Amino acid sequence: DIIIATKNGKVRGMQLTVFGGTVTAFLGIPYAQPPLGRLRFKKPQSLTKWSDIWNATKYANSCCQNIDQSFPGFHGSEMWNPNTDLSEDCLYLNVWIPAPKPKNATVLIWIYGGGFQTGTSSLHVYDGKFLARVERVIVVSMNYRVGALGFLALPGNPEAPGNMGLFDQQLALQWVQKNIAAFGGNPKSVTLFGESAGAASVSLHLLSPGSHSLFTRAILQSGSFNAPWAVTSLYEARNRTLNLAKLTGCSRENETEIIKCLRNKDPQEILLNEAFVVPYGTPLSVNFGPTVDGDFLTDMPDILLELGQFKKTQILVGVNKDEGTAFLVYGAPGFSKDNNSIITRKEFQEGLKIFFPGVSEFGKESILFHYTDWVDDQRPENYREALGDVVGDYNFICPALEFTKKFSEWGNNAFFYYFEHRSSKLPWPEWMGVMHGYEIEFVFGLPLERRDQYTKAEEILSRSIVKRWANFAKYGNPQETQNQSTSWPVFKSTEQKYLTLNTESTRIMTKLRAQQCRFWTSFFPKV
Amino acid sequence: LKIFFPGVSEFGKESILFHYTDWVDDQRPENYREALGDVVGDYNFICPALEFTKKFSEWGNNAFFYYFEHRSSKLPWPEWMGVMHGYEIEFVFGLPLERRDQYTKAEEILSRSIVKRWANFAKYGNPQETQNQSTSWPVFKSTEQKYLTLNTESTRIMTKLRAQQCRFWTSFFPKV
Amino acid sequence: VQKNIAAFGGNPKSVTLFGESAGAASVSLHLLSPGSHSLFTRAILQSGSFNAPWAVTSLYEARNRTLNLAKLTGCSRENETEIIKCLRNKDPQEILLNEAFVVPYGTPLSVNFGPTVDGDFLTDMPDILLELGQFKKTQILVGVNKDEGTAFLVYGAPGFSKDNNSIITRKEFQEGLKIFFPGVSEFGKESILFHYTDWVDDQRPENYREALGDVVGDYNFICPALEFTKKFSEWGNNAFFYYFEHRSSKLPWPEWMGVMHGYEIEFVFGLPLERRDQYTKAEEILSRSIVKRWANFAKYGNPQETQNQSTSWPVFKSTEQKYLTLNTESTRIMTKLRAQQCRFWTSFFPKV
Ligand SMILES: *[C@@H]1O[C@H](CO[C@@H]2O[C@@H](C)[C@@H](O)[C@@H](O)[C@@H]2O)[C@@H](O[C@@H]2O[C@H](CO)[C@@H](O[C@H]3O[C@H](CO)[C@@H](O)[C@H](O[C@H]4O[C@H](CO)[C@@H](O)[C@H](O)[C@@H]4O)[C@@H]3O)[C@H](O)[C@H]2NC(C)=O)[C@H](O)[C@H]1NC(C)=O
Ligand SMILES: *[C@@H]1O[C@H](CO[C@@H]2O[C@@H](C)[C@@H](O)[C@@H](O)[C@@H]2O)[C@@H](O[C@@H]2O[C@H](CO)[C@@H](O)[C@H](O)[C@H]2NC(C)=O)[C@H](O)[C@H]1NC(C)=O
Ligand SMILES: *[C@@H]1O[C@H](CO[C@@H]2O[C@@H](C)[C@@H](O)[C@@H](O)[C@@H]2O)[C@@H](O[C@@H]2O[C@H](CO)[C@@H](O)[C@H](O)[C@H]2NC(C)=O)[C@H](O)[C@H]1NC(C)=O
Ligand SMILES: *[C@@H]1O[C@H](CO[C@@H]2O[C@@H](C)[C@@H](O)[C@@H](O)[C@@H]2O)[C@@H](O[C@@H]2O[C@H](CO)[C@@H](O)[C@H](O)[C@H]2NC(C)=O)[C@H](O)[C@H]1NC(C)=O
Ligand SMILES: *[C@@H]1O[C@H](CO[C@@H]2O[C@@H](C)[C@@H](O)[C@@H](O)[C@@H]2O)[C@@H](O[C@@H]2O[C@H](CO)[C@@H](O)[C@H](O)[C@H]2NC(C)=O)[C@H](O)[C@H]1NC(C)=O
Ligand SMILES: CC(=O)N[C@H]1[C@H]([C@H](O)[C@H](O)CO)O[C@@](O[C@@H]2[C@@H](O)[C@H](O)O[C@H](CO)[C@@H]2O)(C(=O)O)C[C@@H]1O
Ligand SMILES: *[C@@H]1O[C@H](CO[C@@H]2O[C@@H](C)[C@@H](O)[C@@H](O)[C@@H]2O)[C@@H](O)[C@H](O)[C@H]1NC(C)=O
Ligand SMILES: *[C@@H]1O[C@H](CO[C@@H]2O[C@@H](C)[C@@H](O)[C@@H](O)[C@@H]2O)[C@@H](O)[C@H](O)[C@H]1NC(C)=O
Ligand SMILES: *[C@@H]1O[C@H](CO)[C@@H](O)[C@H](O)[C@H]1NC(C)=O
Ligand SMILES: *[C@@H]1O[C@H](CO)[C@@H](O)[C@H](O)[C@H]1NC(C)=O
Ligand SMILES: *[C@@H]1O[C@H](CO)[C@@H](O)[C@H](O)[C@H]1NC(C)=O
Ligand SMILES: *[C@@H]1O[C@H](CO)[C@@H](O)[C@H](O)[C@H]1NC(C)=O
Ligand SMILES: *[C@@H]1O[C@H](CO)[C@@H](O)[C@H](O)[C@H]1NC(C)=O
Ligand SMILES: [Br-]
Ligand SMILES: [Br-]
Ligand SMILES: [Br-]
Ligand SMILES: [Cl-]
Ligand SMILES: [Cl-]
Ligand SMILES: [Cl-]
Ligand SMILES: [Cl-]
Ligand SMILES: [Cl-]
Ligand SMILES: [Cl-]
Ligand SMILES: [Cl-]
Ligand SMILES: [Cl-]
Ligand SMILES: [Cl-]
Ligand SMILES: [Cl-]
Ligand SMILES: [Cl-]
């Protein structure tokens, strides 16, 4: 029986057997007042003392959210859906620590993604026990509020100021600063890591003065705040808060009374209407996301990035080879996960209208022009592949590269990767390639479990990624120093070197997607 | 090894085996097949060509290095033999420009680009394709050792071809 | 020392660690250990460093050896703590008597029980900490003696004796490799033989004798000390490297063993300054100069002798790799000590 005294109370954990060793897990420690009733839509409030022993032996509730129902019964989608009850009472975190208890272990804090509308830290692919066992780091992960309940904004109004889910994250970071030493952790060696909206989050913590003393270093997997989906404009946010009000019968004029009315609706009514606050939007649109609130975010983040107003530290950033393909089977005509989705020119153009809805005809023609000058006129998969690259370059790759360039220009070491291994177990079809989300299981070391159907080469790849991530967290340098590995060079805005991650040959390459990103980053923002 | 290195000591041959058989997976059936081909190709062609180019460029002259990795669609040898010795020649001489002759469209484009780069090298000392938004071919210098890959898909600038293998053949192996 | 040396007239902010062989390896681990960082200023490493092959016991070696010691003393249990409690009731002599046998193949000099990655003093494998710059940023002075390996040869290598000139044959050489590299493959040992036996003259009788000593000294001391110094200087700090090549006039070991492991120490501690004690005048001058350079290093971070028209000691940088030779005749600046040998031990041999 292992009991740790925290600043707010005792917590009891449980022992896990991992690779013939032991890991101690504390699942579901509360870190804030449950944001219920009058606390709905507000910043998270500090948690007051308890005097008994809190049993942290099961994952806690996941935050309320609309789940993915486009592929019922299919593991490729359902692996991302919440696996604990949904509840507004969801502000909990998880701690995995090595056994025996470490003396001053580096701490990895995971922030899940899911478009700021979904996600939970209890997913199988985020299980921190392998990292704790294999690299003797402490892994922490938190639930934070998503969708309108986490990001509804009336800027300036503390009844619904925006960015609440980011403040949830920030309060979990504070909890680690105050408490992880009792667990054997070093609060001066904390690395944030996250994927998709979790990476965008990590990048906003680099920008937020309130987060600067709460962590050391940062890892951004397939996301950054400058991605086009990651920050909601204050005009978008007001229109959407107001549309949600009308849709729920809560239109008022004392702005605070819209909020009080929204506070009496059941979670289900709020969730049901979230999808429709945007005139044109898909199962994946970021209806309620981060905003410039004047608190967490003091200015438009593109300005802060460009002018060097961010935490000066090392970053590790990267993207997967086929980021865009996942999005195509949620609406683009002609696409299906159950066939090879050979689409025509007309379907391609229709697909652009779905992914770029309020873009001019000329804007969409310019995309088509830049992605359809083929090397062979007659390859049937031309348009299929182009649409996926369009979506992936615009939404993930070019923003991640621009973030890394702009961040490194202020003097800090940055390391960039390109993950191009397709999991042997991937349940999605081969045409979707190296999908968004599917590096995570390598980062968390799932292929280290030989019982679990991965190949030997995937075991070696995950082992190497785990070591590089751990070395980055501990030492600020993502090398594998012992096994004659390719050395990972720093990314500099001139040479733009990056490391490819695959089972065969790991290589140093330069200027990823050079011609594509000049289109998205330089020209396209004008249209 | 005994056939390809006949008057080499037992230790010499063991050292080749040591440097080419530390597998990424113990159990891939083609491990030894692929290793023997790489042994023969690195010793006899690739490492000497790279060493020549380094030593020649060290005296001040522009050098350009390529790595040809396209397997001809018409190749009559089996797939396991890959991008064989001799089989870039037909691209250099422009045979795939003859549409009547069973090559793919991508091979026509590749041969056309190689022919232009060779011709530009002969005429101007610089193997660029300047008109069709092509990857620029950097000079090979003994420090950075940049080279151009030639294939139908994506033509890329890479660095330090066969670095670990050639340190074996060029630095150690001549001692045995 | 931090808490008490001021009462003795000492400056706790000017503390230099120095040590030799396992003591130098220790000094180098204090550079790596966060708990030691505020306890000293500067460091001197004489014939050792933690990256030497004998200096850090693997956690797998260490468990096997703790368990073998348990069986050998009748303390095998399964509550791990109860092995220890049982070991705590044995007499010191019983523990000591069984230490030698915890390793299947080992000599009077093997490091049966050494430093380990304990997660406390040592938070990670030290080679990783060195390579990634995780160590105390300060000046170091590092060096080695010309014949580090010879001492080990008379503790087991066949054909060797301190009481004759130990001319050994090829077969004895190969046998000697098996003693010094016991769990190394046949190919590994052949590769050592290949790199150390391409003679300048086929027929010099002492060829194999000299080669075996250089094998042992380069692998165990010189190449690790040079690699430590390169890797440490790459993070910005001044490092100074020496090569001690004076054979003590009083040395009781035979001349063929040369400038042995351990035999710079008496010069460092100034024993030849005692004229009553049978050293030559040149050895008095050499010890006096070494003592001044060591003291200047401790006090000022710079091992010069500034007053007597001495060779200036350059910093060691990973590009030029300059080092200072220490001898009674002529003290010289040289470059890239053991270049070809160390490329073998440091780059190739760890693969075998
Ligand atoms: C938080 O966890 C603790 C401990 O959790 C356990 O610890 C590990 C080591 C394993 O043993 C796992 O089983 C658990 O994870 C919880 O403490 C348990 O509380 C129960 C109460 O339900 C206790 O069990 C029984 O013990 C007493 C011994 O005297 C019995 O007498 C009790 O039965 C009585 O119930 C009647 C109620 O009026 C009473 O009048 C009768 O006379 C009857 O005898 C009791 O059921 C025991 O203290 C713990 N259980 C175990 C297996 O150790 C703690 O409850 C958890 N906190 C929660 C759930 O909020
Ligand atoms: C800002 O919101 C208005 C209103 O949105 C409508 O009402 C909401 C409650 C919700 O159900 C939305 O889906 C509705 O669209 C948007 O105005 C609508 O725009 C569409 C197409 O442009 C049009 O067909 C509707 O008739 C409009 N409805 C009204 C009431 O004007 C408006 O487009 C939003 N602004 C932006 C920039 O998207
Ligand atoms: C691939 O499938 C899409 C999706 O169609 C659905 O899923 C299929 C696997 C099958 O079960 C169909 O019955 C389903 O309707 C096909 O897209 C449809 O294409 C035709 C015309 O092209 C028509 O039925 C619909 O308009 C399309 N439906 C959607 C949702 O786009 C597509 O044609 C298939 N492509 C190939 C190459 O087989
Ligand atoms: C790990 O230890 C085993 C056991 O060591 C033996 O028992 C000890 C108490 C001690 O007396 C040692 O000297 C013994 O050797 C090693 O296994 C032995 O290996 C040798 C040669 O390889 C063999 O002849 C013995 O029969 C083995 N004995 C047993 C009990 O298995 C083993 O080699 C050690 N591991 C390593 C990597 O050295
Ligand atoms: C040098 O001496 C070694 C050691 O032999 C012992 O010490 C000698 C000084 C002398 O007192 C001997 O009687 C001792 O046995 C000699 O090594 C021996 O060599 C012969 C065969 O070569 C044989 O007696 C033993 O196998 C060896 N013993 C050992 C312990 O190695 C060596 O031959 C002498 N070399 C020279 C050049 O004189
Ligand atoms: C509130 C929620 O989402 N989940 C609860 C959980 C469920 O409500 C319950 O399992 C029915 O679905 O109930 C938890 O608490 C239980 C107590 O009500 C009771 O003492 O019986 C159980 C004893 O084992 C248990 O403690 C749970 O099962 O953990 C609490 C959880 O938040
Ligand atoms: C734990 O370690 C602390 C020092 O942390 C160091 O600095 C930060 C920035 C990281 O880079 C980390 O890896 C370093 O070790 C000490 O100040 C503290 O006293 C230590 N505490 C315990 C209990 O060991
Ligand atoms: C002793 O000297 C102290 C200063 O030490 C200085 O700094 C360290 C880092 C060394 O380089 C040392 O040689 C320097 O002199 C003073 O702070 C202290 O007050 C002094 N105390 C007495 C009693 O003189
Ligand atoms: C109405 O608006 C005023 C002014 O902002 C505010 O003080 C008040 O709390 C709001 N609600 C009510 C019920 O008065
Ligand atoms: C390095 O290789 C060893 C086997 O030689 C393996 O056990 C270990 O997991 C590897 N380490 C990393 C970090 O890949
Ligand atoms: C360049 O492209 C044109 C068509 O746009 C083609 O006809 C020509 O052969 C190409 N030239 C080279 C050198 O590849
Ligand atoms: C036996 O093992 C337990 C568990 O580690 C430990 O608490 C105990 O002190 C050990 N010894 C005895 C005598 O119980
Ligand atoms: C320098 O030379 C003088 C004599 O000229 C001698 O007494 C002194 O010991 C020497 N000092 C050093 C540091 O060698
Ligand atoms: Br948006
Ligand atoms: Br070799
Ligand atoms: Br050892
Ligand atoms: Cl690609
Ligand atoms: Cl077309
Ligand atoms: Cl590219
Ligand atoms: Cl452009
Ligand atoms: Cl094999
Ligand atoms: Cl290569
Ligand atoms: Cl080599
Ligand atoms: Cl010498
Ligand atoms: Cl000989
Ligand atoms: Cl030398
Ligand atoms: Cl060599």
Ligand 9 contact via A257 beta carbon (within 6 Å): yes
Tell which of B19, B20, B25 to mutate to test the A interface (max A CBs under 10 Å).
B25
Q: How far is C193 from chain B (nearest CA, A)?
A: 11
- Contact (CB, 8 A) for A372 and A386: yes
Instruction: State the distance from the centre of ligand 25 to the C-alpha of C171, rounded, in angstroms.
Output: 10
For B98, C116, C127, C290, C300, the CA distances from C15, given in Å and listed in that order, are 81, 26, 25, 18, 11
**Catalytic machinery residues of A:** 196, 323, 436
| Catalytic residue flag (residue C80) | no
- Contacts of residue A505, Cβ cutoff 8 Å, sequence gap at least 6: none
* Triad C299, C304, C305: Cα angle to 5°: 105
Cβ of residue C124 closer than 8 Å to a chain A Cβ: yes
How far apart are alpha carbons C33 and C27 in whole angstroms?
Answer: 10
**Which residues have a beta carbon within 5 Å of ligand 22, which is an ion?**
B 162
Domain residue limits, chain C: 1-352
CB atoms within 10 A of CB A372: 13
Computed on alpha carbons and rounded to an integer, the radius of gyration of chain A in Å comes to: 22
Rounded to an integer, what distance in angstroms lies between the CA atom of residue A103 and that of residue A184? 5
Sign of the torsion angle spanned by Cα atoms A517, A521, A526, A527 = positive
User: Hey, what amino acid is at B163?
Assistant: A
Q: Which of B26, B106, B133 sits opposite A376 (nearest CB)?
A: B106
Annotated binding site of B for tacrine: 85
Ion ligand 26: residue ranges with CB closer than 5 A: C 338
**CA-closest residue to ligand 11 atom 2:** B132
Q: Are C248 and C326 in contact (CB under 8 A)?
A: no
Pocket perturbation via mutation, ligand 2, pick of A236, A243, A262 by most ligand atoms within 8 A of CB: A243
Whether A333 contacts A351, CB under 8 Å: yes
| Resolution value (Å, 1 decimal) | 1.9
A456 touches chain B (CB under 8 A): yes
For tokens 């049966």, what's the residue? Answer: C112
Which residue out of C131, C227, C351 would a mutagenesis test of the A interface target, given it has the greatest number of A Cβ atoms within 10 Å?
C131
Question: Is the C-beta atom of A189 inside 6 A of ligand 7?
Answer: yes
Query: For C187, which of B18, B172, B175 is closest by C-beta distance?
Result: B18
Set of chain A residues whose Cβ sits within 8 Å of the Cβ of B133: 515
Q: In what order do the strands lie in the sheet with A53-55?
A: A3-6, A9-12, A53-55
HEC assignment per residue over A206-253: HHCHHHHHHCCEEEEECCCCCCCCCCCCHHHHHHHHHHHHHHCCCCCC
Q: What is the DSSP letter of A86?
A: B
Residues enclosing ligand 10, CB less than 6 A? A 463-464, 467, 480, 482-483
Tell which residue, C67, C37, C53, has the closest CA to residue C225: C53
- Whether A186 lines ligand 7, by a CB cut-off of 6 Å, is yes
* CB neighbourhood size of A471 (10 A): 23
> Which candidate from A375, A455, A484 shows the least CB-CB separation from B109?
A375
C22 CB neighbour count, 10 Å cutoff: 17
> Order of strands, edge to edge, in the sheet holding B146-150?
B66-68, B146-150, B157-159
Q: Enter the tokens of residue C21.
A: 């062989």
Q: Which residues of C touch B176 (CB under 8 A)?
A: 194
Question: Between A382-392 and A361-371, two packed helices, what is the crossing angle to 10 degrees?
Answer: 120
SS3 B1: coil
Residue A377 CB less than 6 A away from ligand 1: no
For ligand 12, atom 4, name the residue with the nearest CA: C79
Chain A interface test: which of C59, C80, C128 (most A C-beta within 10 Å)? C128
Residues 465-504 of A with CB under 8 A from B: 484, 503-504
C38 lines ligand 8 (CB under 6 A): no
Residue type, position A152, single letter? L
Separation between Cα atoms, residue A74 and residue A429, nearest integer Å: 12
Is residue C75 within 8 Å of residue C86, measured between CB atoms?
A: yes
Q: Which DSSP state fits B171?
A: I
Query: Could you tell me if residue B59 is left (phi over 0), alpha (psi between -120 and 50 degrees) or otherwise beta?
Result: alpha
Four-CA torsion A261, A263, A266, A268, nearest 10 degrees: 100
Q: Is C261 a catalytic residue?
A: yes
Would you mind telling me the total number of residues written for chain A in this entry?
527
Locate the ligand 4 atom nearest the alpha carbon of residue C72 and give its number.
9
C285 touches C44 (CB < 8 A): no
> CA-to-CA distance for A422 and A519, rounded, in angstroms?
27
How close is the Cα of C110 to the center of ligand 10, in Å?
26
**C:173-192 residues touching chain B, CB 8 A cutoff:** 187, 190-191
Touching chains, C (3+ CB pairs < 8 A): A, B
Q: Report how far apart, in Å, the C-alpha atoms of C244 and of each of B46, C146, C257 are.
A: 44, 6, 14
